[PDB]
């Protein structure tokens, strides 16, 4: 019923900025996104989780390897009060100051309640 | 480094798994035969507030602690059968491990 829309490959230029699109594409009533996680599966274990977004608490970048200085969520919104709900369906990542280290596979994964783990995979080249 | 543990035992049979990490759990997913959302067959989804969803082999699902779950499945599982548990946790991200019955 839901799928992750990613680009198969993203091409970037050294020192430049790129975006990695990721959308949980079919907006489905009653489907809740409890977390978004970006991973680099090819990395060592302690560097595999590179970005996360929580509905209430916003982003984390627990691996240093891209790290918080060069990585960001373009559109994900945390909830701002009891009135307004989080918006995690657009998990697109921006990566700045591209280096050769950033090349590889990236997986974007939504932890959704009824449906479970839903993921898509992109390869980034520099 | 966070750690996920998986224990598979014959009672029907039981899957137990838990997360040893530095943040709370946003979601647990359990799969048969491969990784959650990436090849495995989904057995259960557990959310701390929204509750439990489960699929046919899994007859019962529960939280044993705030960081661990238990599933009872009707069997049949082989010694070679893999079961995987994935924990989505902020701020550390998503962590998964897979286990099987003792041979
Ligand atoms: C796993 O074990 C069962 C029971 O012995 C057997 O039927 C099945 O072929 C085995 N699967 C693999 C992939 O070895």
- Domains of chain B, earliest start first: 3-99 (2.60.40.10)
Please check whether residue A88 is in contact with residue A76, taking contact to mean a CB–CB distance below 8 angstroms: yes
Q: Bridge-partner residues for A94, per DSSP? A: A19, A72
Query: Is there a contact between A54 and B88 if contact means CB atoms under 8 Å apart?
Result: no
Solving technique: X-ray
**Cα–Cα distance between B87 and B90 in angstroms, integer?**
10
Nearest Cα to Cα of residue B31 among B10, B45, B11: B45
Q: How far apart are CA B43 and CA B37, in angstroms?
A: 11
Question: CA–CA separation, B9 vs B79, rounded Å?
Answer: 10
To one decimal, the resolution in angstroms is 2.0
Q: Report how far residue A24's alpha carbon sits from residue A3's, in angstroms, rounded to the nearest whole number.
A: 6
3 state SS of B43: strand
Tell me if the bond preceding B91 is cis, omega within 30° of 0.
yes
Superfamily name and number for A1-126? Immunoglobulins (2.60.40.10)
Maximum distance among all Cα pairs of chain A, rounded to whole angstroms: 43
**Beta-carbon pairs below 8 A across chains A and B:** 77
Per DSSP, what are the bridge partners of residue A18? A95
Flag if A111 and B50 touch (Cβ within 8 Å).
no
Give the three-class secondary structure for A45: helix
Residue with tokens 């994935």: B86
């Amino acid at each position: 019923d839901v799928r992750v829309q990613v680009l198969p490959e993203v091409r970037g230029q050294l020192g430049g900025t790129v975006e990695l699109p990721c959308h949980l594409l079919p907006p489905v009533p009653g489907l809740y996104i409890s977390l978004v996680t970006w991973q680099r599966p090819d990395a060592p274990a302690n560097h595999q989780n590179v970005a996360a977004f929580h509905p209430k608490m916003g982003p984390s970048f627990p691996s240093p390897k891209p790290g918080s200085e060069r990585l960001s969520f373009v559109s994900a919104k945390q909830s701002t009060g009891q009135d307004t709900e989080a918006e995690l369906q657009d998990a697109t990542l921006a990566l700045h100051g591209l280096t050769v280290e950033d090349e590889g596979n990236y997986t974007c994964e939504f932890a959704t309640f009824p449906k479970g783990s839903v993921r898509g995979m992109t390869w980034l080249r520099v | 480094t966070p750690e996920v543990w998986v224990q598979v035992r014959m009672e029907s049979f039981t899957i137990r798994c838990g997360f040893l990490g530095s943040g709370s759990i946003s979601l647990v997913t359990v799969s048969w035969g491969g990784p959650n959302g990436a090849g495995g067959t989904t057995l259960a989804v557990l959310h701390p507030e929204r509750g439990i969803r489960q699929w046919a082999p899994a007859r019962q699902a529960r939280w044993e602690t705030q960081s661990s779950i238990s599933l009872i499945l009707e069997g049949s599982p082989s010694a070679n059968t893999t079961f995987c548990c994935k924990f989505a946790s902020f701020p550390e991200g998503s962590w998964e491990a897979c286990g099987s019955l003792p041979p």
